[PDB]
C-alpha cells in the first residue's frame, strides 16, 4: 500500500538526482540571458506584490517591477534559475552567480 | 494513538519566504489538527518533525537553505514535505 | 503597505475620474464593484482597504 | 487567471485512446431514448436529449 | 463512511476521490466532449501523483 508510494518517491528522487548536473561541470553561459532577466524581474515583482519580504531600501516607490529591478541592481534576489538541457538534465545557477548583459 | 509519517505536497505563500517551516505549519498543518483526515486514518492530535524536500537533489540534507519550486504563473511555491503525524482512530 | 498611498486615492476617485478604480477584490474572492456607489461609501471602502485578515484561510492574501 | 489562486497539479502529457462501450455505460448519467427534447409548456422530457441528468437547463437544477 | 457519495437521484457511490484541480482552457473541455462524441478518449496525466 504505502510501500508502493515509497518506491515511487524513491524512483522520482533518484531520477531527479541523476538529471541534475553538479556545479563543478556546468557548461552553460556565465551571462544571464535576456529571457532569464525578464522572468526573474517578473517573478520577483509578483512575490513583492504578494507581500514578500524585500531586501532593498524603498525610495518611496510603489511599482513592484521597479522594486524588483532595484533588487536585481543590488543583487538581492533570492531566486535560482534551473536551465534545462534538451534531454531533461538541468543545471542550477543562482541569480547573484550570473552577470547581467 | 499512532505515529503516521506522511508526505504531502503543500504550497508556500510569498509572505512566509523567510521561515518556510512556520509557513507550512500555519498554512497546512495547523488546519489539520483535531479533524478526521480521510488519509491517515483518524483525528490528528499533532505533528512533529517537519522536513522540506529540497528541489535541488545535489545539496546535502545537512544544509538549512533549500530550494522551493515557484509556480510559473503565481508567486506561490510548491514543495514536497515530510512530517510525522500523531493520529487516533478506532 | 507601499501601495495604499495611491490605491486608496484610486478607490476614492472611483470608476470615472482617472486615475481611478472600478472594483475591489476581497481576500475571499468577493468582487465589490464601485460603479454604483457614492463618495462616502467609496471613502469607507478605501479606509478599510488594508485591514488585517480575520479569516485564517486567507491570512496569506490581501485585497486587489 | 488570478495570481492569488495557485494550482498545484499540472497536465504533464495526454494519451489518445478508444472510449470502450463498457466504461461509457459505467460513467453515464442517463440513457437517451425518446427523440423528443421538450414537451408542451416548454419543459424537458425525461429520457430526452435535454434531460436534467445531462446538466441544468433553463432554471432547472441539474438532477445529477 | 468517508468514500461514499450521493447523486441527486440518490444512487449511492463508493469510489474515486483521487481528483485534483488544474488550470486549463474551456475549449479544451469542449474538444473533449466533441471527441467523446467520436468515441475517442483523452487521458491527461497530472504531475503530482
Amino acid at each position: 500500500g504505502p510501500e508502493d508510494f515509497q518506491q515511487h518517491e524513491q524512483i522520482r528522487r533518484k531520477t531527479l538526482k541523476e538529471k541534475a548536473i553538479p556545479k563543478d561541470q556546468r557548461a552553460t553561459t556565465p551571462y544571464m540571458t535576456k529571457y532569464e532577466r525578464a522572468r526573474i524581474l517578473g517573478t520577483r515583482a509578483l512575490q513583492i506584490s504578494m507581500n514578500a519580504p524585500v531586501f532593498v531600501d524603498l525610495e518611496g516607490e510603489t511599482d513592484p517591477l521597479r522594486i524588483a529591478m532595484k533588487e536585481l541592481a543590488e543583487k538581492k534576489i533570492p531566486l535560482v534559475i534551473r536551465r534545462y538541457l534538451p534531454d531533461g538534465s538541468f543545471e542550477d545557477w543562482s541569480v547573484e552567480e550570473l552577470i547581467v548583459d | 494513538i499512532v505515529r503516521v509519517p506522511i508526505a504531502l505536497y503543500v504550497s508556500l505563500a510569498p509572505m512566509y519566504l523567510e521561515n518556510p517551516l512556520q509557513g507550512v505549519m500555519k498554512q497546512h498543518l495547523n488546519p489539520l489538527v483535531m479533524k478526521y483526515n480521510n488519509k491517515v486514518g483518524g483525528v490528528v492530535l499533532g505533528y512533529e518533525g517537519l522536513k522540506i524536500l529540497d528541489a535541488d537533489p545535489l545539496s546535502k540534507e545537512d544544509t538549512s537553505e533549500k530550494l522551493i519550486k515557484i509556480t510559473p504563473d503565481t508567486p506561490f511555491g510548491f514543495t514536497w514535505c515530510h512530517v510525522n503525524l500523531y493520529v487516533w482512530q478506532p | 503597505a507601499y501601495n495604499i498611498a495611491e490605491l486608496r486615492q484610486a478607490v476614492i476617485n472611483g470608476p470615472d475620474k482617472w486615475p481611478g478604480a472600478t472594483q475591489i477584490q476581497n481576500e475571499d474572492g468577493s468582487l465589490v464593484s464601485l460603479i454604483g456607489m457614492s463618495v462616502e461609501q467609496r471613502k469607507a471602502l478605501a479606509n478599510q482597504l488594508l485591514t488585517p485578515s480575520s479569516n485564517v484561510s486567507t491570512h496569506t492574501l490581501n485585497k486587489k | 487567471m488570478d495570481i492569488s489562486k495557485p494550482v498545484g497539479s499540472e497536465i504533464t502529457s495526454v494519451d489518445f485512446g478508444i472510449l470502450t462501450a463498457k466504461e461509457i455505460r459505467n460513467l453515464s448519467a442517463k440513457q437517451i431514448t425518446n427523440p423528443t427534447v421538450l414537451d408542451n409548456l416548454g419543459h424537458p422530457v425525461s429520457g430526452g436529449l435535454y434531460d436534467l441528468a445531462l446538466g441544468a437547463f433553463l432554471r432547472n437544477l441539474c438532477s445529477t | 463512511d468517508s468514500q461514499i457519495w450521493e447523486d441527486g437521484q440518490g444512487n449511492k457511490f463508493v469510489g474515486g476521490n483521487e481528483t485534483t484541480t488544474v488550470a486549463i482552457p474551456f475549449v479544451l473541455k469542449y474538444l473533449d466532449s466533441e471527441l467523446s462524441a467520436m468515441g475517442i478518449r483523452l487521458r491527461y496525466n497530472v504531475e503530482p501523483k
Binding site: - | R3, A7, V10, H28, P31, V40 | - | - | -
Partner: peptide
C-alpha cells in the same frame, strides 16, 4: 478548500507504528 490552506496531495510514507 483551496491550494492555500490544505495540502494538494497526501501520501503515507510507512505503515502506522503504534507508540
Amino acid at each position: 478548500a483551496t491550494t492555500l490552506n490544505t495540502p494538494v496531495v497526501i501520501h503515507a510514507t510507512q505503515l502506522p507504528q503504534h507508540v
